[PDB]
């Protein structure tokens, strides 16, 4: 709300200029209305009497001729100054439209794109996009202003019809009116946006919902006949070709389609699809290929033949065969939302991406999935960097460059056999989501440490001190590294704990069973950490 004031200041300026231009047009109408009555006086005086003496007739005729030439000189002057006023009106309307064009481009091409990008990022666990009531109010002011100016210009056109003065004013009005229709088309087509987009990575037969909105709908007389909006699922090639306006239905049948509703209190025109269900799908990989939900409608503005065909595209959606593949499919979505270009041709993502750029997305989605504000720290980030690029470095700035190809992210296996770097990271995400979210928030799980790295870090600690790291041995497991003096002369080796283990006994109970483990990493004792989570 710092440089939002810039927008509202420009809006007050626009309001003032349209108001004073309307006042100018009122004065011009009064001027013309008086001019035509004086011109009718000239018509009555035009061309002229009954029987009189030749002495009085000369006087009468010369007085009438005087009145006639005077009235002609008065009319030519009045017409001239009237035309001056008219061209001034056209000039002021032009100026207002130019600045309104700048403002509309500011809102539609920047702020709306910013909000849509907020939405895009929220799909990866980022901050929520927020409410469009600010953008809705802005678009209401835009529509109000431009429609009022259209009314003023058409009124000037009608006024020019009744008393035509040659000049260059008709071309000015024609040029300005075309600009008006162009602006209206841009506004109406650009403010048909998906408020809550439908949740990507969806299976067939499952009910999902999305909500689309018309930001300008409150006014502009679209609400008078709330149009029907139809949703249909189309492939990526279909979306690409449609944006180029081809013709082709690329993803079989969709269950629903609905009509818009207007909340007078909220003052919003929106379409709520609460019960859509995907029942069939046409169909490189069974899971990488992305689709999109297309919403389209058509509506009229007031009493005009002006009909707008509008369409909008959801951000890319992936269709899952069965839950087994779902864990992988989100990876695809993760890249798109993370790395979609601003003016991208539909669903085109870079294959390169630098490491810190991927780090920001991984960290964001991690804090989202584990439902905590702990998140990824620098040491964790170096751990995953050493995991991805087999490279001997323990400083983050050494990995400040480096490009993570999509393949090495999710297609090429690591030096192990884990389903690429993404599967291991999604595995730790899932194990902490379903089982160990509280222990992650509490700080008991260091996790992002290595066996030897956990070792030398843990040697000096007193006997009985443990720490839990995420196993590179198994995908979804965590292992324990412990401190005892005899240790190596003893046997004792434990298997990593996975979801299967955690389902029957749970982590706190497993640690309770092991009496020889008594301190969490630094000085924290076991009971202090796990007392509330032990099973009474």
Numbering used by the authors: 138 to 184, 188 to 388, 392 to 426, 433 to 685
Sentences from the paper on this structure:
The activated STAT dimer translocates to the nucleus, initiating transcription of target genes and altering chromatin involved in loop formation in enhancer-promoter landscapes. The canonical domains of the STAT family are all present with the coiled-coil domain (CCD, S138-T331), DNA-binding domain (DBD, F332-V470), linker domain (H471-D591), and SH2 domain (Q592-P685). Archetypical STAT-type SH2 domains are comprised of an anti-parallel β-sheet created by three β-strands (conventionally labeled βB-βD) surrounded by three α-helices (αA, αB’, and αB), which are also observed in STAT5B.
Notably, STAT5BN642H was identified and validated as a severe oncogenic driver mutation. To investigate whether STAT5BN642H perturbs the protein structure, we crystalized the mutant using the same domain boundaries as the  wild-type protein (A136-Q703). The crystal structure of STAT5BN642H was solved to 3.21 Å with a similar space group to the wild-type protein. The second conformation showed the N642-containing βD strand dissociated from the βC and βB strands, resulting in an incomplete β-sheet. This partially completed β-sheet places the SH2 domain in an open, potentially inactivated, state.
